[PDB]
Amino acid sequence: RLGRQALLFPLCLVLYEFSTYIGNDMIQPGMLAVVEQYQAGIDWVPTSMTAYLAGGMFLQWLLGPLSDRIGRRPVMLAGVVWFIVTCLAILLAQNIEQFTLLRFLQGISLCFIGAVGYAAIRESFEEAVCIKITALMANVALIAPLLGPLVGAAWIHVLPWEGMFVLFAALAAISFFGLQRAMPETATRIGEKLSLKELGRDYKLVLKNGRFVAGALALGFVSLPLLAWIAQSPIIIITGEQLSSYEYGLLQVPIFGALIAGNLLLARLTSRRTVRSLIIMGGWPIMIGLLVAAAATVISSHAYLWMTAGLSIYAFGIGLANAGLVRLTLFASDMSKGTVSAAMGMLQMLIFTVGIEISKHAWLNGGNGLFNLFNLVNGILWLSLMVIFLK
């Protein structure tokens, strides 16, 4: 059962990952239907993603050391079950507030992927095989924001939005049974005590590292325009520009195609290039992309093609530079990779959570110009942290 069929474990971890990612990505275009069904304002549309990501930073710090003490199996499986239950519970929401609360509770399921599931992969599989699994997880995470809005935009013309959550729960159910028969128990620290004050001691120690913080924050700021696009794309395009769901879906193609193209180029150049130079290389289309989108929409607020072009060029730089910065940020601290991962995960989520809300009020008040102007300052914040980060 060990050699061939142990791949069911990473496979099911991947499937669970995908279901939680489209859990955000399929829902965003569906938020228009949701918000119309509850008769709520369009300002709750991006907040759906905010609450989801806020839930993802909630148990982050806790899950890694906890699953180390009580085992990774019961923690991972409990997480998948929690995702299924919360996905089904949102059908009873009855209110946009309660909908957002359950959105938050769903987001907690995100914490289980990296802190426990992936920790088990790192423990179960050799550094060799681990690399491939991480690559598969990276590929899938690239496919979600590309396919999700496409499928989601089509879904609301056929089936009710409630059906999407039944879909996520279904895919998660498959991962559950798979993981239940596949995932090994890798936890070393059973049954050792868990000290919250010593745990908090570790997080205060990583936050004292100057280079780490700069790199972790930079990851947040630089990816914020992309996530803000994902969050606000339905209301910017469909409600704001009065375009259709077909145009909405079409515009996602050059943007996330360029993201993928960026990673593909990254994969080809990684042997002859150093992550430091990849950052500088990705830096150009990132700054130019954000500049083009801001400038064009300050001139003419209604040009979404210039904005999309800009976001596409920027997403290409992201694909190239980001995986590199993740490595450097990880290796900028000598502490436990679990504590380090959770810290940078939470720092990014904080920037995403607050950033999406800020981005929302930017667009509500100033339209597209302000949306892109705020995305531009985020790029400059990333650039600013880069000159510090190296050297």
List residues binding ligand CLM (CB under 6 A). Answer: 20-21, 24-25, 56, 110, 141-142, 144-145, 223, 226-227, 230, 318
Q: How far is the CB of 129 from ligand CLM (least distance, A)?
A: 22
Q: Shortest approach of ligand CLM to residue 355 CB, angstroms?
A: 12
Specify the residue, 33 or 187, whose C-beta has the smaller distance to ligand CLM: 33
Q: How far apart are CB 210 and ligand CLM at their closest, in Å? A: 25
Token pair for 188: 């070393």
CB-nearer residue toward ligand CLM: 227 or 320: 227
Q: Which is nearer to ligand CLM, 225 or 369 (CB)?
A: 225
Within 13 A of 293's CA, how many CA atoms are on the CB side?
31
Minimum CB separation from ligand CLM for residue 36, in Å?
21
Cα(59)–Cα(159) distance, integer angstroms = 33
Q: Which is nearer to ligand CLM, 187 or 259 (CB)?
A: 259
Query: DSSP for 35-87?
Result: HHHTT--TTHHHHHHHHHHHHHTTSHHHHHHHHHHH-HHHHHHHHHHHHHHHH
- Judged by beta carbon, residue 110 or residue 296, the one nearer ligand CLM is 110
Contacts of 326 (CB under 8 A, 6+ apart): 219, 344
Tokens matching residue 241: 């520009």
Task: Using the structure block, give the residue that is written with the tokens 């550094």.
Answer: 127
Q: How far is the CB of 194 from ligand CLM (least distance, A)?
A: 25
CB-nearer residue toward ligand CLM: 20 or 209: 20
Q: Which of 258, 264, 262 is nearest to 282 (CA)?
A: 262
Shortest distance in whole angstroms from residue 352 CB to ligand CLM: 7
Helix 210-233 to helix 127-155 angle (10° resolution) is 30
Shortest-Cβ-distance residue relative to ligand CLM: 24
- For residue 59, count other CB atoms closer than 10 A to its CB: 20
Shortest Å distance, C-beta 287 to ligand CLM: 17
Q: Which CB atom, from 20 or from 297, has the smaller least distance to ligand CLM?
A: 20
DSSP notation for 351-383: HHHHHHHHHHHHHHHHHHHHHHHHHHHHHHHHH
**Minimum Å distance from CB 388 to ligand CLM?**
22
Distance between alpha carbon 61 and the CA centroid of its chain, in Å?
17
142 or 258: whose CB is closer to ligand CLM? 142
| Residues listed for the chain | 391
